[PDB]
Design a protein around this ligand. Structure first.
Ligand SMILES: CCCCCCCCOCCOCCOCCOCCO
Ligand SMILES: CCCCCCCCOCCOCCOCCOCCO
Ligand SMILES: CCCCCCCCOCCOCCOCCOCCO
Ligand SMILES: CCCCCCCCOCCOCCOCCOCCO
Ligand SMILES: CCCCCCCCOCCOCCOCCOCCO
Ligand SMILES: CCCCCCCCOCCOCCOCCOCCO
Ligand SMILES: CCCCCCCCOCCOCCOCCOCCO
Length: 305
């Protein structure tokens, strides 16, 4: 009976954990979202982004996702400060698998951002958005079967960093980011072998921090620039306020959320072609987490005019 409860707990937690990965997948940063916004002349901008990636965690859990996003903004020219304010919309397709389940998630989001680029090299990036998730998951345990459900998430993120130039062409940039969010809970109630089974979790609020450093070496000519860059960071949960409750004829088991953290690694470039076009590309992965990004690639394109 202990073994049964252990397995049930492990499985319920695995299945419900996908809502948290769905949330984590929508978390980016200034460079990953917008590319390089320094020294841009155009007073308006249109941009697109695509990300594709895969991750894993124990229990044979693995997922992969394709994230697509666009935005438009106006750039306000202030005294030593460019301030980009704009709108954004996103789409995500995810699939997930573990030993005991598999399924998919379709997401649609919309948000608002302000990005402040200071001549001094300082920057601040603020974003808030809402994401809707349609979910379809099939479980191989407990006769739970196929389950469709909606969730939605709010995001409020703030990021600051500082680009210190070691030389005219090389630079170092410490960064810190905090992202506060919400994840709607859901319930499954069903019968198996003529017994009433329940599995439910509550609304919770992720709070994800990151601290890291980026480094870059740039090259250019009259009408182009290319920056090679690499990143090392630390991404961590500050809260784990979720809880799954497994109810049963014999009683309830409560399963509290666990914090997880991981080391982020990235390598990439930012390109400038003439006056309107920018392009950003990076390869990334993480290590040491219970969940890790095993690999993902991010591309963006900004047209400034
Ligand atoms: C921590 C959450 C705070 C979120 C910051 C939001 C405040 C800044 O948002 C301003 C958005 O305004 C959009 C500007 O209008 C868009 C014009 O661009 C379209 C025309 O090309
Ligand atoms: C959420 C806390 C953000 C920290 C404030 C950052 C202010 C940076 O602006 C300074 C611009 O000039 C840099 C010298
Ligand atoms: C500041 C974030 C606002 C999100 C923009 C679109 C709002 C969509 O929310 C609809 C809620 O249902
Ligand atoms: C700058 C903070 C942005 C947070 C998003 C606003 C919260 C939207 O949820 C409103 C409804 O939720 C009810 C809370 O319980
Ligand atoms: C403002 C922050 C500037 C300095 C922070 C940089 C730290 C980047 O390296 C941290 C690497 O350590 C990762 C630890 O991995 C987590 C292990 O536990 C799981
Ligand atoms: C993938 C190449 C990354 C470029 C590293 C250059 C770092 C220069 O600044 C060091 C100080
Ligand atoms: C080096 C990596 C470069 C990748 C850039 C991919 O985008 C191709 C941009 O094509 C340039 C368009 O031709 C110039 C006309 O538009 C002027 C842009 O301001």
């Amino acid at each position: 009976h202990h073994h049964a409860n252990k397995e049930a707990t492990r499985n319920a937690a695995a299945l419900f954990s996908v809502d948290y990965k769905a949330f984590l997948n929508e978390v980016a940063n200034l460079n990953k979202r917008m590319g390089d916004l320094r020294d841009i002349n155009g007073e308006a901008g249109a941009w697109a982004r695509i990300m594709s990636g895969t991750g894993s965690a124990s229990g044979g859990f693995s997922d992969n996702y394709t994230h697509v996003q666009v935005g438009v903004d106006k750039k306000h020219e202030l005294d030593g400060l460019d301030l980009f304010t704009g709108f954004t919309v996103t789409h995500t397709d995810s699939s997930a698998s573990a030993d005991v389940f598999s399924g998919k998630t379709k997401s649609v989001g919309a948000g608002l951002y302000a990005s402040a680029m200071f001549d001094s090299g300082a920057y601040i990036d603020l974003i808030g958005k809402y994401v809707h998730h349609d979910n379809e998951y099939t479980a191989t345990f407990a006769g739970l079967g196929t389950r469709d459900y909606s969730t939605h998430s709010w995001y409020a993120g703030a990021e600051a960093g500082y680009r210190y130039h070691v030389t005219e062409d090389a630079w170092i940039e410490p960064q810190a980011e905090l992202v506060y969010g919400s994840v709607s809970g859901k319930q499954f109630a069903w019968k198996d072998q003529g017994m009433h089974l329940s599995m439910k979790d509550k609304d919770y609020n992720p709070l994800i921090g990151r601290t890291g450093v980026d480094v870059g070496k740039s090259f250019s000519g009259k009408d182009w620039k290319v920056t090679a860059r690499a990143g090392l960071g630390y991404q961590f949960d500050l809260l784990a306020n979720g809880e799954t409750v497994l109810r049963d004829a014999s009683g309830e088991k409560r399963i509290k959320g666990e914090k997880d953290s991981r080391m982020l690694m990235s390598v990439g470039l930012n390109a400038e072609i003439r006056d309107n076009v920018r392009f950003g590309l990076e390869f990334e992965k993480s290590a040491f987490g219970k969940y890790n990004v095993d690999n993902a690639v991010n591309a963006n394109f900004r047209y400034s005019f």
